[PDB]
Amino acid sequence: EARDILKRPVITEKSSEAMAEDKYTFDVDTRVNKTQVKMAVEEIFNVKVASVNIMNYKPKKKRMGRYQGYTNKRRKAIVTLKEGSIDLF
Amino acid sequence: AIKKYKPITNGRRNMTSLDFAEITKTTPEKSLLKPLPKKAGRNNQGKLTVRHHGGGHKRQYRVIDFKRNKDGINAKVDSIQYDPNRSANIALVVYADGEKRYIIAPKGLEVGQIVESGAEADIKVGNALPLQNIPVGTVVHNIELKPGKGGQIARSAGASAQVLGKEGKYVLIRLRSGEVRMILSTCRATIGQVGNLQHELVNVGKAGRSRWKGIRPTVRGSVMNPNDHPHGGGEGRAPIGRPSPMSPWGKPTLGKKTRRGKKSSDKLIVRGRK
Amino acid sequence: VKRTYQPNKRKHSKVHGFRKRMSTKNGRKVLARRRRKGRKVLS
RNA sequence: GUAGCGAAAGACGGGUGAGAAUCCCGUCCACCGAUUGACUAAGGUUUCCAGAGGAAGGCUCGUCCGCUCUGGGUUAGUCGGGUCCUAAGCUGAGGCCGACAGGCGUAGGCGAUGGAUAACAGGUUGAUAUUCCUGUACCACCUAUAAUCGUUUUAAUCGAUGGGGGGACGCAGUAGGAUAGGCGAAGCGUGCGAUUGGAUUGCACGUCUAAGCAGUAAGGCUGAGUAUUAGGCAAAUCCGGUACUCGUUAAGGCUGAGCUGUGAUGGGGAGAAGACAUUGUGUCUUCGAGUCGUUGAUUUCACACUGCCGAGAAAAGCCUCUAGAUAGAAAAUAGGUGCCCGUACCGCAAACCGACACAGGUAGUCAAGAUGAGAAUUCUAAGGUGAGCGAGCGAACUCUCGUUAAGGAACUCGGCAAAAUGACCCCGUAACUUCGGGAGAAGGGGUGCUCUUUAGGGUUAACGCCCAGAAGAGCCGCAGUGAAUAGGCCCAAGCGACUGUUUAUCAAAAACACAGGUCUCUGCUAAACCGUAAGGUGAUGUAUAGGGGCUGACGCCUGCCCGG
């Protein structure tokens, strides 16, 4: 743990408008809580977290050439650290 | 007394009611109440077994002391009260230590009156005694069939039974039906007649009032079809085309007796009617 | 005008549904049938 | 190349484009308006937002789309749910019954549609917001902080698997007391018309949350204190009976109580344009512009009070008191810490149920102005929409609508349908009645505008401010509730007493119910009924009760036959 509950960052215009502030958006494991998320980012990036909000996204239906299905459900977190930065690109 | 309403409405023409004058407290005691949900004539299988029971006004159950065990501790009558679960009114009494109970209200009971239970007690209205210690000739109510179980006979409005004699360990007693019976001399009973005597004189006036009291309608067999009743059928109005009137479940219902033989009480009964 | 099947998720999953089928021996038989037939959904 | 293209007002200009009645923008016009409006549940499940697209779908077209492709979008200590309580019901170890399967049932457990429970204003996106940002608060847990109880029995506090109170409740009606909304006007802001006239003259405006300081408008109170104990499975300093002192005063002693004034906030935004070089001058970096004053006032105080019978949940949270418990807690500060699920979008519908982008159905909340008793009626703000095939001609026939000379039911099974009546005020009104009624009986009459007033509801201060007390005097018209909306009436026979209910989808009735009668059964493990039984209903009822049969308000009555 502490490096497997965080999987990917999210890069969008909204996430970048957030990164203009101290807000950073991640995609995490579907079974973990915001407390685990906070402890994990503090352990990894060596920063101090203020708040962490979180949401669950449903599976989206998809089609591709007579083969329909569902995407994977995903859990998104938004952390709002007090001071510090993260060298993303 | 009984009040007659004026005939402002065709549903109020010949309709009567009670005054509720002998009621002196129109609010019950919080502690002696329990819930009473409606069964609507439906058993543990959820099936309708008795007809004509349904949804009337909501009620709470007043817990009554039919067994007058509190011996040697006189109690003072605190109030008379209305009971929806019953035709007779009830009396809230308070014992010397503060324990309070409900009893059935007899005819000539009054607030402040004193009432006691036991063999040492005296023959006054409201008092409970064993039948051994009650003298012959007097009227009683709330009689036990088995000692310590509680009153089962003479509980309704205006009900009374009178002692007639004394056997070895039994006493002869005459009931409101005209039946005489043998009751154990240890079985308890209360002195006096039950109150609310005018309860039998009300004219209910309108169907909605029966619906409030929880009576659904009854529909006659002669206007059913044959698959539903023995009297069903006929091209128009028809008479009872059988030798005897019959129930909906295929049994005689006029004059045929239904008590079953080989009961223990068959010998304790000496003269019976109805 | 009013039509049959006024849907309800709770009642659907309560009168149908896996636990309700498994609560009775005959409801355990419809599952065995759907498994044997190869049904993708059992409840 | 026929029937049909699913209720409804569109017109023009400009633009985009290969291509336009159908797409975008603009002006005008029109429609819904107790709704074609705005929210919230259920249900649906990405239909949401940007770009791109015209093969298929769209009842035409299509540059458009709830369609296709690509990529994005749902942020909570306080919102609704679970970590709380229980109702009906469902399961139910032991246990009962039973060919098997299995059925029932005790403690218990599960279970909201109920109870308990801490957050408000402003800003901001293409798409979320009481969730993000700002500000100001509130509610719990933990840790340090130290003045207070200092055997720890007791003690504020710990305190029961303990107790008592409370939560905790119906229906209708009445009266008030505040408040949202709403309102005349010179506080003050604002711009002055072009077709004649006028210039107090047109039109508007006057604000603002949760929380915390003070009090408060009325409501309830055998209202305050002493003594004792057959009790609260054991304990109690709390509950209950009784004997006394101030006694029915309500001072204000007491619990509860709508709401009001300062700060919150000289912050926000502000009828503002005066601020632009720009942000297409739309907008905004800068600096103020009213927080005045009358009239009448849903919801809330609380089922408060009053009355009525049909006599109107439970448990927990909570409040007090406890034997035993422990040093020993607290609070008031400062720190921290506050998990999980949902949140997009449609939502009285093009996304739900209906085979459909179906004239149907779908629980709840809010709902302005004029007219009026009114949520009726007609028009209209705000908001939403112009409805998803069109252009012409104005034949027969069919449907919907209006008007028709003379006559007036002659039509027809039948005055079916249509016509007529219709509001408010006044005058008057029969038979017959169970004395309630009938009765809105029938039948007549009146209603506009202007000036006088003597004067009523008074706006009342008073004629003025609205209706008038409504009395006179006038004016106009074919017509004065000038539109819309708003009872046809009488006489006499049957049936059924009445209100009600009935064949979802050809029968709403004289058929069923009914309240009242009567007969019969049943002495309580009652009879009766369900079930193989166990267990249940009847009934936590007990002959003034319960079941069954017939009859069917009320009044006068209810005859003969017991041979079968």
Numbering used by the authors:
A (entry chain R): 2 to 90
B (entry chain C): 2 to 275
C (entry chain 2): 2 to 44
Task: Please share text taken word for word from the publication where this structure appeared.
A focused refinement of both large subunits resulted in a 2.4 Å and 2.3 Å cryo-EM reconstructed maps, respectively. These maps allowed for the unambiguous assignment of ery within SAuL22m_ery complex structure and for defining the interactions of ery with the rRNA nucleotides at the binding site including the identification of the nucleotides that bind ery via hydrophobic interactions as well as its hydrogen bonds. By inspecting the structural changes that occur upon ery binding to the mutant ribosome we could identify a cascade of movements. U746 moves together with H35 by about ~3.0 Å to form a bond with OP1 of C2611. Then, A1614 rotates by about 45o where this rotation is stabilized by a bond between N6 from A789 and OP2 of A1614. Due to such cascade of events uL22 ß hairpin loop shifts to the tunnel wall. Upon ery binding, an additional groove form in SAuL22m_ery structure. Thus, we suggest that the uL22m new groove widens the tunnel in which the nascent protein can pass and bypass ery’s steric blockage.
The NPET, which is lined mostly by the 23S ribosomal RNA (rRNA) chain, initiates near the PTC and transverses through the large ribosomal subunit (LSU). Four ribosomal proteins (rProteins), uL4, uL22, uL23 and uL24, of which the globular regions are located on the ribosome surface, extend to line the tunnel walls. The mutations in uL22 including insertions, deletions and single amino acid substitutions are mostly located on the ß hairpin loop of uL22, which extends from the globular domain of the protein and reaches the tunnel wall. We present here the single particle cryo-EM high resolution structures of the apo and ery bound SAuL22m mutant ribosome, which demonstrates how deletion of R88-A89 in S. aureus ribosomal protein uL22 ß hairpin loop leads to ery resistance although it does not hamper the binding of the antibiotic itself.
